[PDB]
Amino acid sequence: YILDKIGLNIEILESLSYESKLGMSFKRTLSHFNKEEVLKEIELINNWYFSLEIIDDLPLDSRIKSVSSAKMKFERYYPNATYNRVFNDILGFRVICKSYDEVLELEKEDKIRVVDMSGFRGIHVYYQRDNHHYPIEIQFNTYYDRQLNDWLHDKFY
């Protein structure tokens, strides 16, 4: 299990799932959500991540989406985007694998959805407890895709 080897077994993935307070299923489209309240919730997720001790103990590169980056991503996708498709990356990790084969087997699990992309390249894995929790993003990248991604960063930004 590539996830269990990295630290991200199901108990950890579950205790990392932030339970929304917005009363809204994340299968609804952005049109149904109160932007003022969403942004507040992101502030609280921010505060919650910067106090977690289990992320410290994890051998992983991690990032929380800032309230400013969520606000941009919200307006960029309003009104007809699904919420669990836009805000599927609020908490995110980045790892390198020796191969992609064993990553694409995570599709066959429950609660794990996989988005293959092998300008850029790589494989994104999403754990979502249920439809009123935020999904955790995991970007996988062999050395071949990680150096192409980093090199494209230099000629873009």
Ligand X SMILES: Nc1ncnc2c1ncn2[C@@H]1O[C@H](COP(=O)(O)CP(=O)(O)OP(=O)(O)O)[C@@H](O)[C@H]1O
**What are the start-end ranges of the E strands in the chain?**
61-64, 91-95, 112-116, 123-127, 136-140
89 annotated as ligand-binding: yes
Contact pick of 2, 125, 137, 142 for ligand X (by CB under 6 A): 137
Chain centroid offset of residue 121 CA? 16
Cα 47 to the chain's mean position, in Å?
17
Q: Binders of ligand X among 90-119, rule CB under 6 A?
A: 92-94
Q: How many residues bind ligand X (CB under 6 A)?
A: 12
As given in the structure block, the two tokens for residue 103 are: 């990553």
63 binds ligand X (CB under 6 A): yes
Span interacting with ligand X, options 17-25, 63-71, 108-116, 144-152, rule CB under 6 A: 63-71
Q: Which does 73 bind (CB under 5 to 8 A by kind): ligand X, Mg ion, none?
A: ligand X
Choose among Mg ion, ligand X, none what residue 139 binds, the Cβ cut-off being 5 to 8 Å by kind: ligand X
For residue 89, state whether it binds Mg ion (rule: CB under 5 A): yes
Task: Report in angstroms the alpha-carbon separations of 139 from 30, 66, 70.
Answer: 24, 18, 18
Neighbours of 126 (CB within 10 A): 19
Contact residues for ligand X, defined by CB under 6 A: 61-63, 65, 69, 73, 89, 92-94, 137, 139
